[PDB]
Scaffold this active site. Sequence first.
Site, mmCIF file in Angstrom:
data_model
loop_
_atom_site.group_PDB
_atom_site.id
_atom_site.type_symbol
_atom_site.label_atom_id
_atom_site.label_comp_id
_atom_site.label_asym_id
_atom_site.label_seq_id
_atom_site.Cartn_x
_atom_site.Cartn_y
_atom_site.Cartn_z
ATOM 1 N N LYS B 54 -0.004 -2.829 -7.183
ATOM 2 C CA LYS B 54 -0.695 -3.041 -5.910
ATOM 3 C C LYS B 54 -2.068 -3.680 -6.073
ATOM 4 O O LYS B 54 -2.612 -4.234 -5.120
ATOM 5 C CB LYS B 54 -0.847 -1.722 -5.143
ATOM 6 C CG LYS B 54 0.450 -1.119 -4.597
ATOM 7 C CD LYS B 54 0.972 -1.877 -3.389
ATOM 8 C CE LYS B 54 1.865 -1.031 -2.514
ATOM 9 N NZ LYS B 54 2.836 -0.185 -3.281
ATOM 10 N N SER B 77 0.610 5.387 1.010
ATOM 11 C CA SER B 77 1.046 6.629 0.374
ATOM 12 C C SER B 77 0.225 6.903 -0.885
ATOM 13 O O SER B 77 0.335 7.970 -1.481
ATOM 14 C CB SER B 77 2.533 6.581 0.035
ATOM 15 O OG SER B 77 2.832 5.467 -0.779
#
Lengths: 322, 322
Positions: B54, B77
């Site tokens: 990410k 999350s």
Amino acid sequence: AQYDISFADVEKAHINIRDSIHLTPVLTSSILNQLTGRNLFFKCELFQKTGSFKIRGALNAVRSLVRKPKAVVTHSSGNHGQALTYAAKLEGIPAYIVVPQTAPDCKKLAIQAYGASIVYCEPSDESRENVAKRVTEETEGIMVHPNQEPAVIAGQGTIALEVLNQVPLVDALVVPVGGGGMLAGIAITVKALKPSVKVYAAEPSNADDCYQSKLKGKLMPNLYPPETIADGVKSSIGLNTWPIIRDLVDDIFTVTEDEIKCATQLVWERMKLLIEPTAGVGVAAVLSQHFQTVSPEVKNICIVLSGGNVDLTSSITWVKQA
Amino acid sequence: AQYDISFADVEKAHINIRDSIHLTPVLTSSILNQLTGRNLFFKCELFQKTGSFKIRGALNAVRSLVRKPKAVVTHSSGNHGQALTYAAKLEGIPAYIVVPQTAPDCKKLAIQAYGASIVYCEPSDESRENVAKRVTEETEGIMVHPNQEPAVIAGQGTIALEVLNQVPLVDALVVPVGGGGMLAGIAITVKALKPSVKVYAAEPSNADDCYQSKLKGKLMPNLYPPETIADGVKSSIGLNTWPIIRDLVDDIFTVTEDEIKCATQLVWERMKLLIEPTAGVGVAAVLSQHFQTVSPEVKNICIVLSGGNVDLTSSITWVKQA
Ligand SMILES: *Cc1c(COP(=O)(O)O)cnc(C)c1O
Ligand SMILES: *Cc1c(COP(=O)(O)O)cnc(C)c1O
Ligand SMILES: [Mn+2]
Ligand SMILES: [Mn+2]
């Protein structure tokens, strides 16, 4: 001047095993650099065939035998046993591995998975050696000692040949010590090629024979069987590795159980490398208070992450939440 | 023909982030090759900065803003949240991360460690989106969506640029799918450079919106909030990634909770890579019964090991002894 191996033995071993092992990577960690103020490099032997660097000495020893042998025999807390069984299986040679009753379940099971006959002994150097001797006689096999066998020591030393190539500006290697096969092979190698590079041992305070031996200038084996989470370095140093360690190793750093547990968990969480606690011993050493006394000139430090054979189920006991 | 990103966007993203990320290694496993009958390659994004891939989309998005922004905001999350906070911190920009109450503790804590303001929401796509919208308005910040933002998608796609270079004979990529940012970026990239290379998604049966969408030929989001150990892929695919996935992804493989747990533990034990269960989804896919139907011509398969952010304390529940 003259030890049980030479640099030439290590060089020869490297050529003879390199086609059969992994040239494991050297990884880095920004957080561990920040914590230590050093430039750290991690030699990832946990990714080696069978889960530890022991495949190096095992392959070298088995190929140094080359009628084929009836059997190979050893004693092992697990890693040398797995490696020897694998190496022997490649040549169609059966293996008998003498293993202390209190070795981790994962290691006992892996030895059996590779097809060895496992023989439990009592948890002590004396029991390991005596039972391996009896098994060798009964099987008419060949004993391949986990740390005192010259071919084994020369094989482990090949780690340093790779480190010196992969980290050309390295200032020190940090090596966990049990029987001293790896430490001795690495010391012979580093001091032959670039002796300005420091060779430091890392050892559990709970199994501190190498530290005691260096302090007293004589071989001082563990008086009681060690109790430590660093399950792969419970062996005392031996007669063949001691002289090399005495003469060629620069310093020895001891680390407590708590330090080993903390460093191991830090590597898991921050590097995502599933090292076994024995491999955490070297990381704990560089994080330790006493390592801060190492000269600031010793900047580029390569730590050998020696193995990844850890019982996940058994590690639920000591793992602590933040 | 025209999607929300192009190959050129991915190329540009790669140049703009490469100096700030790791060119993560590709590792192999003999046992996993044996189990699958394929030649497997593991792209180790678990070693990326912040513990997942990410960081690629986050750095690309933050640098695509370049008075500086008042704040960046997202819902996550955990992995995108950590990455966005880190990327924003480098530029002196505060971060507000909206996180479901049931995200893993390790991920909640890491977001706070990087200095973000964490805002818990209810565990659903609707709650994540609505709370992020409210936080964006209140802070007058800039929303950086975890998977639908073009700059984010282009950043994730850069994984494929590296894989195609590192594994020049690759026949397929296997990619875990949640919101579809990674899957879409990789699909755009692979199909632009060498479309003969397959792009396969891997998805939990317990969060099977992408599979359902492809089957029905329309976007079918999860009706109930997913219950899965693959905590990072509970999001449904979105309006920007769906068309790319519809058109450019070759197949989608679903895997049960048990399969995810087994594959994750297998990677830990055999590869010594501490992947999070979400990253085990791709490994489970290649081990699955349905993957055996993939043509034998598809031999060289690269699986993206997307992250290593796992709660060790919470993983004591599902870990099974041999
Ligand atoms: C064997 C081993 C050591 C110690 O090596 P010695 O040659 O016995 O000193 C350290 N770490 C691991 C994982 C080992 O298997
Ligand atoms: C985000 C993430 C995924 C899924 O990526 P999407 O772009 O949401 O499909 C998979 N694995 C990990 C570890 C992730 O963080
Ligand atoms: Mn000792
Ligand atoms: Mn899904």
